[PDB]
Amino acid sequence: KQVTVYRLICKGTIEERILQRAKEKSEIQRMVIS
Amino acid sequence: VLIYSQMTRMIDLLEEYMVYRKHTYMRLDGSSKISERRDMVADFQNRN
Amino acid sequence: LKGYQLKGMNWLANLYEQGINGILADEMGLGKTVQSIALLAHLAERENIWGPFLIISPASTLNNWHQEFTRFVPKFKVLPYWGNPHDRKVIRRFWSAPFHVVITSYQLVVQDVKYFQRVKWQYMVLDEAQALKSSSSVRWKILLQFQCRNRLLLTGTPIQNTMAELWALLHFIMPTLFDSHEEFNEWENQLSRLHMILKPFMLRRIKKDVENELSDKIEILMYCQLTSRQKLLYQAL
Amino acid sequence: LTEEMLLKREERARKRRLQAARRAEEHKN
Numbered sequence: 001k002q003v004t005v006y007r008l009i010c011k012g013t014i015e016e017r018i019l020q021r022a023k024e025k026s027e028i029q030r031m032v033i034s
Numbered sequence: 035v036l037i038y039s040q041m042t043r044m045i046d047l048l049e050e051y052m053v054y055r056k057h058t059y060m061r062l063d064g065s066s067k068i069s070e071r072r073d074m075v076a077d078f079q080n081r082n
Numbered sequence: 083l084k085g086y087q088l089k090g091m092n093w094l095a096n097l098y099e100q101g102i103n104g105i106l107a108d109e110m111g112l113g114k115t116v117q118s119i120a121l122l123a124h125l126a127e128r129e130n131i132w133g134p135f136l137i138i139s140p141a142s143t144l145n146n147w148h149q150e151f152t153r154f155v156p157k158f159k160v161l162p163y164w165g166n167p168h169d170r171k172v173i174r175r176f177w178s179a180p181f182h183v184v185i186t187s188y189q190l191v192v193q194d195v196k197y198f199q200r201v202k203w204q205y206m207v208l209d210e211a212q213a214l215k216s217s218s219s220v221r222w223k224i225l226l227q228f229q230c231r232n233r234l235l236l237t238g239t240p241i242q243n244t245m246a247e248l249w250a251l252l253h254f255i256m257p258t259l260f261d262s263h264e265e266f267n268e269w270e271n272q273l274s275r276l277h278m279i280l281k282p283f284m285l286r287r288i289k290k291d292v293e294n295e296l297s298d299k300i301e302i303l304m305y306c307q308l309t310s311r312q313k314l315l316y317q318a319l
Numbered sequence: 320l321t322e323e324m325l326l327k328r329e330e331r332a333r334k335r336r337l338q339a340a341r342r343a344e345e346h347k348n
């Protein structure tokens with residue numbers, strides 16, 4: 001089947017920092033394996 | 035659908051919502067007993 | 083069994099003869115339990131039968147293992163080990179070795195150590211071993227002391243944090259080869275060193291090579307605007 | 320003489336294995 005995935009995040013509050021640190025980690029987490 | 039959330043305090047608010055708009059729902063906090071998890075997973079498979 | 087699983091079995095069998103521990107770091111949804119169970123399913127050698135296995139795992143997962151052993155390998159017999167102290171005490175009588183395998187939770191193995199020290203387990207399957215990632219943890223300190231042929235880690239999306247956790251996981255896998263975090267300050271200058279160190283023990287798959295029949299995840303980020311009541315409180319903070 | 324303690328311990332063995340059967344099947348659900 002399909003799979004869809006959603007994030008709900010507020011404009012400009014604080015949750016953006018969480019998303020930024022997650023994004024920063026996510027690419028480092030690739031290159032150290034493949 | 036699966037809904038994931040990061041505060042038990044919030045999963046309580048979500049449960050109040052799932053009861054109000056009558057969707058049917060089932061919840062598995064870390065506070066659930068190990069035996070409950072078995073039934074609750076086996077009921078999310080095997081049913082529409 | 084699927085082709086990549088069978089190649090996994092031949093690889094694990096090589097490591098088994100060589101006496102080598104490692105990480106079966108396949109991406110989640112490819113059958114990492116099924117691969118570990120195949121160390122018994124095709125196991126005509128009998129060595130793996132008449133001495134007990136441990137499966138050690140995080141709490142919600144204790145169920146699936148029972149169903150997976152009973153569906154794939156009815157040749158075996160399996161012991162629960164969770165719940166009431168009474169049931170634990172009772173089950174300790176049955177393994178006082180037709181008790182071929184025992185299913186266990188990290189939170190119990192870090193307490194009932196005295197009982198687990200009583201028997202020479204053949205192998206430990208530490209399921210979802212990303213649980214062990216910090217060497218400061220009692221879990222890590224204690225789980226180092228159990229004696230067995232192999233320690234087998236089935237954790238997908240492994241490592242991936244900071245080099246202290248790399249040392250902790252790798253030194254859990256091998257008691258030799260690693261002495262301190264200083265080696266891992268000298269180990270593409272960094273990346274290539276780590277790759278070559280991991281390659282003899284650290285399988286991979288990546289979903290797009292094998293999950294060819296699955297849809298890709300459509301991933302949405304949805305921005306939301308907070309309400310008047312939220313503005314008032316957020317501002318007051 | 321010895322048969323009493325032997326058949327007692329045999330009865331304890333089937334008692335144990337009945338509890339093993341029951342408390343193993345408590346894992347079903």
Ligand SMILES: Nc1ncnc2c1ncn2[C@@H]1O[C@H](COP(=O)(O)OP(=O)(O)O)[C@@H](O)[C@H]1O
Nearest residue numbers: 083084108109110111112113114115116117238
């Ligand atoms: N060869 C196979 N035959 C049947 N089911 C399989 C097979 N390989 C994988 N699966 C299924 O895929 C899932 C594997 O889960 P698990 O063993 O935890 O793998 P992973 O850790 O990659 O998610 C289960 O639903 C299992 O039934």
